[PDB]
Write an enzyme that holds these catalytic residues in place. Structure first.
Site, mmCIF file in Angstrom:
data_model
loop_
_atom_site.group_PDB
_atom_site.id
_atom_site.type_symbol
_atom_site.label_atom_id
_atom_site.label_comp_id
_atom_site.label_asym_id
_atom_site.label_seq_id
_atom_site.Cartn_x
_atom_site.Cartn_y
_atom_site.Cartn_z
ATOM 1 N NE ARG A 258 45.653 31.877 31.905
ATOM 2 C CZ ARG A 258 44.828 30.846 31.855
ATOM 3 N NH1 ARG A 258 43.587 30.931 32.332
ATOM 4 N NH2 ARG A 258 45.244 29.675 31.352
ATOM 5 N NE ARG B 86 39.165 44.495 46.333
ATOM 6 C CZ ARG B 86 38.299 44.630 45.365
ATOM 7 N NH1 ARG B 86 38.683 44.790 44.096
ATOM 8 N NH2 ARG B 86 37.039 44.671 45.661
ATOM 9 N NE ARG C 158 35.872 50.880 36.778
ATOM 10 C CZ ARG C 158 34.905 51.465 36.096
ATOM 11 N NH1 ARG C 158 35.120 52.594 35.437
ATOM 12 N NH2 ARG C 158 33.714 50.888 36.040
ATOM 13 C CG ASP D 175 27.079 48.844 42.203
ATOM 14 O OD1 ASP D 175 25.946 49.259 42.083
ATOM 15 O OD2 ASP D 175 27.701 48.350 41.271
HETATM 16 C C1 QI9 Z 1 31.184 39.571 38.585
HETATM 17 C C2 QI9 Z 1 31.283 39.880 39.846
HETATM 18 C C3 QI9 Z 1 31.093 41.269 40.417
HETATM 19 C C4 QI9 Z 1 29.884 41.345 41.398
HETATM 20 N N1 QI9 Z 1 30.092 42.340 42.465
HETATM 21 C C5 QI9 Z 1 30.663 43.559 41.848
HETATM 22 C C6 QI9 Z 1 32.120 43.303 41.357
HETATM 23 C C7 QI9 Z 1 32.307 41.801 41.194
HETATM 24 C C8 QI9 Z 1 32.339 41.190 42.614
HETATM 25 C C9 QI9 Z 1 31.116 41.727 43.409
HETATM 26 C C10 QI9 Z 1 31.483 42.664 44.600
HETATM 27 O O1 QI9 Z 1 32.374 41.990 45.492
HETATM 28 C C11 QI9 Z 1 30.184 43.112 45.296
HETATM 29 C C12 QI9 Z 1 29.710 44.365 45.028
HETATM 30 C C13 QI9 Z 1 28.440 44.745 45.489
HETATM 31 N N2 QI9 Z 1 27.644 43.953 46.194
HETATM 32 C C14 QI9 Z 1 28.085 42.701 46.501
HETATM 33 C C15 QI9 Z 1 27.261 41.883 47.284
HETATM 34 C C16 QI9 Z 1 27.659 40.627 47.627
HETATM 35 C C17 QI9 Z 1 28.979 40.195 47.312
HETATM 36 O O2 QI9 Z 1 29.202 38.932 47.763
HETATM 37 C C18 QI9 Z 1 30.547 38.423 47.641
HETATM 38 C C19 QI9 Z 1 29.770 40.933 46.470
HETATM 39 C C20 QI9 Z 1 29.367 42.231 46.088
HETATM 40 C C1 QI9 Z 2 46.914 32.241 35.904
HETATM 41 C C2 QI9 Z 2 46.686 31.035 36.339
HETATM 42 C C3 QI9 Z 2 46.894 29.769 35.537
HETATM 43 C C4 QI9 Z 2 47.981 28.844 36.162
HETATM 44 N N1 QI9 Z 2 47.711 27.417 35.913
HETATM 45 C C5 QI9 Z 2 47.294 27.271 34.499
HETATM 46 C C6 QI9 Z 2 45.892 27.911 34.265
HETATM 47 C C7 QI9 Z 2 45.632 28.905 35.387
HETATM 48 C C8 QI9 Z 2 45.394 28.084 36.676
HETATM 49 C C9 QI9 Z 2 46.546 27.051 36.821
HETATM 50 C C10 QI9 Z 2 46.100 25.564 36.669
HETATM 51 O O1 QI9 Z 2 45.070 25.267 37.615
HETATM 52 C C11 QI9 Z 2 47.334 24.657 36.841
HETATM 53 C C12 QI9 Z 2 47.913 24.140 35.717
HETATM 54 C C13 QI9 Z 2 49.141 23.467 35.810
HETATM 55 N N2 QI9 Z 2 49.798 23.285 36.948
HETATM 56 C C14 QI9 Z 2 49.246 23.767 38.096
HETATM 57 C C15 QI9 Z 2 49.919 23.534 39.303
HETATM 58 C C16 QI9 Z 2 49.406 23.987 40.479
HETATM 59 C C17 QI9 Z 2 48.108 24.572 40.504
HETATM 60 O O2 QI9 Z 2 47.755 24.929 41.767
HETATM 61 C C18 QI9 Z 2 46.405 25.401 41.959
HETATM 62 C C19 QI9 Z 2 47.469 24.897 39.335
HETATM 63 C C20 QI9 Z 2 47.995 24.452 38.102
#
Ligand code: QI9
Ligand code: QI9
Ligand code: QI9
Ligand code: QI9
Ligand code: QI9
Ligand code: QI9
Lengths: 242, 242, 242, 242, 242, 242
Positions: free
Chosen positions: F42, F85, F24, F203
């Site tokens: 990522r 957002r 997007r 949506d």
């Molecule tokens: C891969 C994930 C995607 C799925 N939906 C669209 C964007 C991403 C997050 C989510 C969105 O929060 C959302 C949009 C529309 N209806 C939803 C209905 C339920 C919902 O539960 C958290 C999230 C919804």
């Molecule tokens: C963009 C996010 C990235 C950052 N770290 C590496 C992969 C992704 C998630 C995270 C991982 O869980 C992790 C690796 C190494 N040390 C960490 C220390 C703290 C932690 O807190 C949830 C997550 C860690």
């Protein structure tokens, strides 16, 4: 027979004295006028006591809330109307409540899980007034000084160092003593329309275990006095149903 | 001596078999090659077992989490390296797990309170892989079919009608069986660097108690087989420390 | 002066009668032997009552736990030793507890927030035995029948339809009545070493509001009797400090 | 096609390797014997891998529990039988678990929210034994030392200073490492009858970030070894369904 | 009539100004163009205000969330479309927000219980934008500087020393001020489709009560200015329904 | 560079537009006057947008709260002053809020975990007024009708059948829509003194997924309009810092 106590339903009396240690049941029965051994299964030992012309059971509940609830539920489901717990406890007020002192408790801290699986946490763990009054009046007749107060009933005997024990908070809140079953008894009793109470002998202070002040010394004369009070109360309460 | 188990510290072996009922300890010791009675205090009965050239304790823990934690902590604090629980349980999958079936469990639902007083709820109750593998390999050697799965360890045996029991939720979540101590064992073990496991015999189904399907019939041959597996595993694990 | 009650510290008596409605204070004072108006700030009206040779305050606390806690704390911080709440409540047992019945309560459900901001939820909301006994003995002297039981003290008067009210659960748990302040009083009292109690008149049943059975009719003779009991108790308790 | 993964239902294989970074999928596919690019939508990149005569998908899950759950659910709903996560993690035992060490995890701390929206907190986040055993046996074949232990799966990467992070508590509880998705995988897998596991490479230590010890250096040879173990395991597990 | 406010249903206007102290209603009415006294029951005083050609009620809510909810619910159930609270509060940012400063609040911390008995804790306590904008635009017209920010609405006025107050955490989180009712108003309003807001005068700082910096001095000119802003806003909002 | 966004600290602009899907970002940049690609790591894609004479970043956050928090924290820690957002969401009011409608949100339900690991649950997830006002005024200029309301930000996309989803409760509470990140953004923003907002396109409706009413059709003209509003707002807000 009762599922786990193994006593017959006909053998349940309206008043029941409960204690933790099956050994203690055998030490109590011999101070009564007479007794009949009923059953012994797992940690649950049951004896019919005869004292001062009345008849009541004495049953062991084991250590801890989940095990005692099995006992208490079976007694409440099968005819018990009054249940008194006699036990040991630790002091939470070491300046004022010392080794061998006796506490007659009216309420308890619900630091268990089974009570919460039965009723929301907001609900109080409280004993019956009448039972409490009866215990206190028996102690007064026998000239045995007692303390009254709230017990912390905690499922954790040995604390670790990650999550702080709540004992010091409860001491600051004016809880008197700590043990492991009274809250559970009280809540099951309220739910089941069974009157409950508690009398406890002090054995140590958890805040002074690092200096060896453990629960390893029941002052023999004080223990006798508590047991006399407990038996006395049972007999008086039993009179109403007889 | 140990504060509440009353066994000497020197008598703690690296592997310990734990069971709920003190009576069961006496039924297990007689199938070993020999034994030495050590102590019996409250619901805690301790015996040194000799089996297949190895030596390990068998100790009773009583009913329920708070009482068993006293036992488990004292064993972990005084030298136990491996603790296997052998017990009974109820089926949560009555179509597939029937009376007398044997479950070797790897993880548990923490429906207690003491585990939560030691560590946050998010933390898993999990057994050691190696212990689990050893149990399964002993069952395979003896040609005894088993189930594997998660146990719900719940402090409430007798539900009431106000707060729903979570058993059906956990059945839907694919929990296999229900008992009262394994989660507690597992969490204390992880905290104390002690390897733990669990083997359980099915006795009834709580969802069918209204039709008399209680925990009142341990299939004798199945119970023997489980105990053989449990003893087998203990002996194998004991070899590493010997 | 007291921060929010606006009474002088010297004017706090050892026994204090508390009520919700400032209007009720004015209706109580006129049944005493004499009175002195002390202060009226916000919903907090204070009057020194003289009755049966003794002197005690009567103070209004307003509707609800957070507002009453301000009152109760100021009284406990400035010398009150005994606090009795006299109030109205709803029946949770409509078959047995009817309009105008009087309940003398020993314990309460902590369905507030301030109690929980002071002490963990497991801690019981319980009154003092002695106060409870005194209330009951005054009711017996005056030949006024009463009920005893647990009150649900809930911060929600008007339920909505999203989160179920817990009233029916608590009815099933054998709670007698529902009101809005007693648990708060009881917990603050225990924390502050102040003896507390509660006497309540039944006004309606929440389970029958859909049929107009509201809290809108205090049976005048029953209300008089309750107030007599409450004043009686205050005077007796006041004798010990005088 | 799958709602958000955009792969066809026919393309789901019984074994799936999941990783966080879509970039990593492209680095893994090139070490296989061959591959077919399937789909790339949002952070979810899917490739069919051919390795050691077997076929399994490799799919990226993104950072964090709520995003990964979408991936995992779609795989479990559409035929996946085994899911292995290969990822990075932080050490919680900096004396013993160092940069580039490899951990094969059996259980996890549920410091997410989606797992709790699916099943009560008491339920364990545990992997399948068999998967864990397979990973360990592949590491042993390749002569690659590994650690085993519990992972803390936390939704908070950057802590603030108001609510303490629970990492130090979990370190004290003997959790080995910290990452962000494994608990979520494990719980969804148990709920859906899908076998799960986890293998992780250590990248830094959160307790030493104030000294620059970040997750910014995957030791290239160690990363290769982990990926070899992960691919090895996938291929062995895939043999049973083929 | 309204059950507890005792005003007739016909007398409820679309805009209502709410304040804590019944005394304050009488001080506000006299600055209006004219007024009609409606009812005074318990702490709930109601007056119909006429100001700038418009008509709106001014009603007292008492101290604290549970008592105010009775008021707010009755107003929302009987036709109120907009409710503005004008009150006092304590500073949580003593370097920047001083005695007599005025805060126009958009959101609140739900440190009550009634809001949680109506809707899950995750739900925000937020005011209506339009009301907030109207208040701010009236302050700008009158050249009265204001602060904007989040209020902590806490049911505990007097903290004890066992469970820490969360005020310092919320200060660190950038909450501006502390009071006792706004969150409750906001949540009931959202549930009932009633637009809400809040304007508050600073009176002290709880973090400096140990140095006498109490809520005991409403700066008279600042209080006048706030009340002018509040009345101004009410009149403007009332125009849309008229 | 930023640890995980990989953009240089100098490249962070005071206003940042965030979106879930890295795709997007590429569709937004081409409607601007010009752009500079900055980084893609990522699921985090970053582009400097030039629009209406102003400069602001557009950055992807991925699916879900824990992953987005990494993004939001890095932006807040490195100079972002305003974060909007723009996203998609599901209707919780299917009678009134239909496919393709646009919602400008002021507050959110905190159905995540990271927000709770940063600040107590009672704290509100609220956007900045000014940002909200700016979005609404841009929609009015462009003659694009919008809805305003609270979003449920839930970490669970795919519900299971054991623990009920809270969506219907929140619908009954007058929440407008459901998505997965806004609450997280709002709380981090308040903690970090960064102004936040949210604009969302409808949506589908989760309550009608059993009839295929999924989130799989962004109405192209409505999506364009939302993106125009979002870009418009960014440019206006950026003017104050420039
Ligand atoms: C891969 C994930 C995607 C799925 N939906 C669209 C964007 C991403 C997050 C989510 C969105 O929060 C959302 C949009 C529309 N209806 C939803 C209905 C339920 C919902 O539960 C958290 C999230 C919804
Ligand atoms: C963009 C996010 C990235 C950052 N770290 C590496 C992969 C992704 C998630 C995270 C991982 O869980 C992790 C690796 C190494 N040390 C960490 C220390 C703290 C932690 O807190 C949830 C997550 C860690
Ligand atoms: C095998 C267990 C025994 C240990 N103590 C004596 C009786 C049994 C239960 C416990 C008792 O509750 C108790 C007494 C005295 N001091 C105590 C201190 C702490 C405590 O924590 C639950 C329990 C205490
Ligand atoms: C005196 C108590 C005994 C009762 N049951 C057998 C051994 C002891 C504990 C319990 C066991 O956990 C168990 C076995 C079989 N079905 C059960 C069903 C429910 C259950 O709830 C905790 C426990 C069960
Ligand atoms: C303005 C408020 C008043 C309304 N009721 C009478 C006195 C004040 C508080 C309340 C009382 O707690 C009460 C009495 C009778 N039935 C009740 C039923 C429900 C209840 O819920 C808290 C409270 C009730
Ligand atoms: C009788 C009670 C009054 C006391 N304060 C003034 C109005 C009433 C409520 C309270 C107010 O919320 C408030 C103002 C100023 N500083 C405060 C500091 C702390 C606070 O805690 C709830 C409330 C404060």
């Amino acid at each position: 027979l009762l599922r786990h106590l193994k006593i017959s339903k006909e053998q349940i009396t309206p008043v029941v004295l409960v204690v933790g240690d099956p050994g203690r049941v055998d030490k109590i029965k011999v101070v009564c006028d007479s007794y009949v051994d009923l059953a012994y299964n797992r940690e649950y030992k049951s004896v019919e006591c005869h004292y001062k012309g009345q008849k009541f059971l004495c049953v062991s509940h084991g250590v801890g809330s989940a095990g005692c609830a099995v006992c208490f539920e079976e007694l409440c489901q099968n005819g018990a109307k009054v249940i008194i717990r006699a036990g040991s406890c630790g002091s939470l007020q070491p300046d004022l409540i010392k080794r061998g002192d006796i506490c007659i408790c009216n309420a308890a801290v619900r630091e268990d899980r089974v009570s919460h699986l039965l009723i929301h946490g907001d609900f109080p763990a409280v004993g019956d007034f009448d039972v409490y009054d009866t215990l206190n009046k028996c102690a007064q007749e026998l000239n045995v000084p007692v303390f009254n107060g709230i017990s912390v009933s905690s499922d954790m005997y040995y604390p670790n160092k990650i999550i702080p024990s709540r004992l010091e908070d409860y001491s600051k809140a004016n809880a008197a003593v700590v043990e492991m079953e009274l809250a559970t008894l009280m809540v099951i009793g309220t739910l089941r329309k069974v009157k409950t109470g508690g009398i406890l002998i002090v054995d140590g202070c958890p805040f002074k275990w690092d200096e060896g002040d453990f629960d390893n010394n029941l002052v023999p004369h004080q223990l006798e006095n508590m047991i006399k009070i407990a038996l006395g109360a049972c007999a008086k309460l039993a009179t109403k149903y007889a």
